[PDB]
Design a binder for this molecule. Sequence first.
Ligand code: NDP
Ligand code: NDP
Ligand code: CL
Ligand code: CL
Ligand code: MG
Ligand code: MG
Lengths: 688, 680
Amino acid sequence: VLIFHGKPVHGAIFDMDGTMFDTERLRFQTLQQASQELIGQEFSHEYLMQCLGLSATTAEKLAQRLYGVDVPYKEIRKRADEMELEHIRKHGVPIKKGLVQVLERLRKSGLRMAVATSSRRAIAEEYLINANVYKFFDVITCGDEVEQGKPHPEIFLKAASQLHLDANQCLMFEDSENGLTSAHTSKGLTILLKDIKEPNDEMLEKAHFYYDQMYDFLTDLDQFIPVMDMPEMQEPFPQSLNQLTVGIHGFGAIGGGYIAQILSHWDGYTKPKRIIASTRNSLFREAVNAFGTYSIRYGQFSYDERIENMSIVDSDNEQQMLEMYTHSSLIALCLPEQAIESESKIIAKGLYARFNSQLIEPLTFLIILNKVGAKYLVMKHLKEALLELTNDEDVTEHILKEHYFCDTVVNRMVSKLSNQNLYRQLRIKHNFLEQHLEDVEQEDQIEIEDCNKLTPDQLNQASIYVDNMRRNFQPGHILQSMDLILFHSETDMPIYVEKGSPLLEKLRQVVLVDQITDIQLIKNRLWNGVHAMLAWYASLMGYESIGVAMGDHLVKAFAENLIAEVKQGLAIVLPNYAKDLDRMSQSFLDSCEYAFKDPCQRVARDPLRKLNHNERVMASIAVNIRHDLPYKNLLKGAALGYAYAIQFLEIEETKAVEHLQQQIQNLDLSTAQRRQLEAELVQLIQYL
Amino acid sequence: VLIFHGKPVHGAIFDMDGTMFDTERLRFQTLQQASQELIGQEFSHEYLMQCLGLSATTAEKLAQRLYYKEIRKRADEMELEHIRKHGVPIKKGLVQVLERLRKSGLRMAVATSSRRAIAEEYLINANVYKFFDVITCGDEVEQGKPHPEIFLKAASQLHLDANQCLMFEDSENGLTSAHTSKGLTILLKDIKEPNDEMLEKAHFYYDQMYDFLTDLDQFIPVMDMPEMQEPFPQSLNQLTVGIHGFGAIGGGYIAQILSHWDGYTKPKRIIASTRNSLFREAVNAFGTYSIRYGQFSYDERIENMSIVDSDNEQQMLEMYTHSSLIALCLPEQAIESESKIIAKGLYARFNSQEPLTFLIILNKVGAKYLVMKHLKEALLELTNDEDVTEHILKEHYFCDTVVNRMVSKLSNQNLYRQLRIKHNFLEQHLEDVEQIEIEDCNKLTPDQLNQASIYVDNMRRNFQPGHILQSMDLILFHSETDMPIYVEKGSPLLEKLRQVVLVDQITDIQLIKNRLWNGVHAMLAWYASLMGYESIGVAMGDHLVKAFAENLIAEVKQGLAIVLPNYAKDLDRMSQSFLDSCEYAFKDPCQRVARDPLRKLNHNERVMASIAVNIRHDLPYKNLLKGAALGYAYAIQFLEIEETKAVEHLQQQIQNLDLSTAQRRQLEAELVQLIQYLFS
Ligand SMILES: NC(=O)C1=CN([C@@H]2O[C@H](COP(=O)(O)OP(=O)(O)OC[C@H]3O[C@@H](n4cnc5c(N)ncnc54)[C@H](OP(=O)(O)O)[C@@H]3O)[C@@H](O)[C@H]2O)C=CC1
Ligand SMILES: NC(=O)C1=CN([C@@H]2O[C@H](COP(=O)(O)OP(=O)(O)OC[C@H]3O[C@@H](n4cnc5c(N)ncnc54)[C@H](OP(=O)(O)O)[C@@H]3O)[C@@H](O)[C@H]2O)C=CC1
Ligand SMILES: [Cl-]
Ligand SMILES: [Cl-]
Ligand SMILES: [Mg+2]
Ligand SMILES: [Mg+2]
């Protein structure tokens, strides 16, 4: 069902200790801590490295040779085991980086999966439950349920037969020599993973595939499992968390109300365990961290999308902002243009702190900014800040080349909730918390009747657990049917990102492009161009918002007829993006409908600059004329621009024509077509 | 575009006061008490009736004409203070109506005489504000109700004409405002008998909100079978539902069916009954439990659960009185004793002040007959009235079901082990949270900023310990991925439920399930158990266990093809569909499937019935006979029932089999000989 290096894989059997969990390094630490406690001297690193693979008796005899015959090894070993369970039970089993990502890929590939551990059923199940990876496995095969353990192939042969499979149909993952022998002899496809000790030549010769760590196998596996499709609206996020952290530099409208969704979807197999987001807004920070989650409201479908595993931090706080740029695998800069200059310093400090970090992988930096050459601006200011910070041109140049700086095109319009509306929301929901908290004490008491199954010692201990659990959880039962709404966003899913970063390859809500130019040109003419032309019409007709204006059937007709004339033109210029034009065309008309929040002021800024020969208006006219297409609405849009310039911005009527004639001359048209365009456009302006 | 009784609908503009919420009755009582604390003399009831669906401005004009700011301010303060304690009284049906209209693709709004500050406070509180694109209040209107401006401005902001929009209203004044707008007016009675003038103005009339819902529902697409990991609805209706028996199938299947519901709304509360206290206290502590689908390693969280005691009477009466749908999920042994608890509940429902949809989940040929027999005997004993019983029995919808899904309940040992592990994480979490002021003016007053700090600090204190539940789940059930339940036609409610498929000849399917499905399932489980396997999934990996099950399937199908020639075509699909579910049932234990061997070895049950059929028609029953022998072998060895009792049962059941004396003695001789052979 799953093809791996030309071999059909129907099953996957994992060793537990050293392969799935990092319990061999923990057993390394506990032995040292137990030694320092009892005998006073800590067992050498060198001794413990020598003991890897040896029996408990050989290890004891070796300890006797080095630390004397009367060395209390058996009670050192027993004390080390106490320390192991004590650590594992509270702090959790240490899971190898990339395991959960690997398990989700094998499971969604329809593999039957087992564990073949030398440990006992009892302790094995607890570890797998503790780690929350028990769910991934159909059967567990244990050392206390086989006549001959590893390196005899029984445990792997048995694990395979229980899954209804031949050994040769299964991948077999293992760290130890005896284990790899057991898996190999059974006749399975052996995956050897280095844990602590470098594997000897006999092991590397024996193994079918070798990797230095789990993540190196994950990278190999990724070639044989598909990138998932574009997520639909109301589609769930993955349940399983990977060990990666991601960042959103600027927890604003687009940061919290769009980028959060993309990072929450991730690759569809797993999602990050933590999303760090920076804001100066104290109310927003403390509110999200209180709930431990916020929600994005999609008005069109009346759907509240819960974003979990969020951790909001202060932008002014260094320790927190450095922790973002140190631990994050991917970061999304979601700032306005004016903020880029000031925030270039706190980025530089972040990337320099990452460079100085003695722990690792190149950062993927998404530039979320609706502007042409948006990446150039950030990289220019970032370079200046890095020089000013370090005064080391070689280090500054290294940092600028190490990481993946990605230019993006975003289409989703998002609205951030006001602090007045947030306070009003917190008041009404704190009210429900009090309403909820007065009838939790109405229940009261814990009662566990005689099970006639559980012993009275553990029956008593069960009462203490559930009582302690209920007391802490019951107050937060209201969160089931209660959300913290901070964002009102449209339904547009796909983000376009510059191809380069390996980490983007599997991100399902991302559309990779070799160069951003093409989709950035569509964004300019089809979206920003119509938005500006539609805003100039609304402003002159005297409507407060572009959303209100759509009530007037003249405005809505103009909008629908305008996106049609532009789309026609772009289809000829970019036939490869035909599907992207149709999707973006409707997406704009949907968002424009109830666009009450966003004003026309900021959209109608610099009309003369937007009426340039190679810009979002005139370029579309010239394209439509060259390929003989209707441009009557684009002409009306251009006129409304010069009309808006004269009336609102107090531009001279002579200065408008002075500009116009220079733009028409620069268009790739016949001298006949140029003079015809001027004559028509000037008459539309004098009417308005 | 929605087609409501022929007319095309593009939008829907509701009234708030007395249409969406029952706030007209509240402000009625506040204005009276407001005119007692201040001026002393209460307002006339005639004045208040003429103030229905009037703007605070227009109501003040009526007051001066007969005889207010101070009066209404105190009245509004009292009104919203009542809302802070009890909540907004949502008219039953509203949430269900709104979701159907929203998903139909209609452009919806609110047109209320109330001002903005109040209008939003309720719409947020009720949590219906998300369903509306725009709202029109009594502020931004120049001339309030009964002038049509407020309903014209509402339709204008939706970018539609009034005649394209539905208009919901309670007041006589507001209906005139809605009618003069030239829209499709709908009238909902609240606290005034509609006049001749009102009933003529209206295009449609309904007694209450829920009466419209039922009429609207026949123009709303019925959503089809849900997929595995498809989410449940977000919005909650006011309906309660019951699971009589929080067991494997009750908690691990029926809970999913009820949680999906119609796909528009979900029950407010699902009440499940269990004697198991650990299960009860565990779910109530977490507030949720999860169903583990091992095939796809997917955990399905079940929200809005209330686990009650089966013995506790008042809680079981709470279920049967307020529930719209009860699901009986008990085995045969429980039916007799629990029929007393059902009798009290149904009698309590009749005494109190909608019909009930009663699902019987029971693997028995003639399941409903047994349930209805014990229920009538139980009812008659308590009521001592034949007139009230024959009404109750033929008032509610008692539905036979076929359930194909295999589900496993978690052991108390494994649940304790789960709680022990997850408690250690909670303890370590509570240390991390130990070691808040909202600083700077965020366009808020110093009073609000200090009030916000108290709200957030208190919210953090209560919620922060429960943050761990984002990742942490309570796993109580292991279930395969079979979605559709098959129910007999009758109950109109089951038409609209997504996960329910309606059928006619339920008896014919129930018989085939008993013999071909549940019979082979039990017999291979006995063979697997005695061979050493503790899992159905692992056992089916054995060539002998699968060869046995395949041979049984063949012998049963050969007999069913004679008894039911009209179903003979379908047997291959069902027999294969069974083996598919068995093949990879790794978390389904043999012990669960091999329960009650003697009951399953009854003369008219999943083993002996097949043996009897094949003997009459001279069909081979060699493997079927071996499975019966393994059934008694399991009972004697694993359950320990005494060998003498196993023979006394064997001899009695063979005596009941519709065979000749020659066949009876030969069957007894062949079977008892084969039992002693296994123990050799
Ligand atoms: N939202 C949209 O409709 C779309 C926007 N975009 C792009 O997304 C980017 C952000 O949009 P949006 O999120 O709406 O911007 P916001 O106005 O919501 O603020 C965004 C973030 O920038 C921070 N910020 C703003 N000004 C400053 C400043 N002067 N100094 C320091 N930090 C500052 C804010 O901090 P605090 O949180 O403390 O305010 C916030 O976290 C813009 O570049 C825009 O072009 C792209 C397409 C669509
Ligand atoms: N699960 C499955 O795979 C399928 C089950 N079914 C049918 O559903 C019915 C039971 O399903 P299942 O849930 O598996 O049974 P379970 O034993 O798993 O659950 C039993 C439920 O009934 C209650 N109960 C059991 N015995 C008694 C009794 N003697 N007196 C009172 N209450 C009792 C239990 O209460 P407590 O919680 O206190 O034990 C529990 O709520 C049977 O008819 C079965 O054939 C249908 C198809 C397959
Ligand atoms: Cl990982
Ligand atoms: Cl309802
Ligand atoms: Mg190992
Ligand atoms: Mg009214």
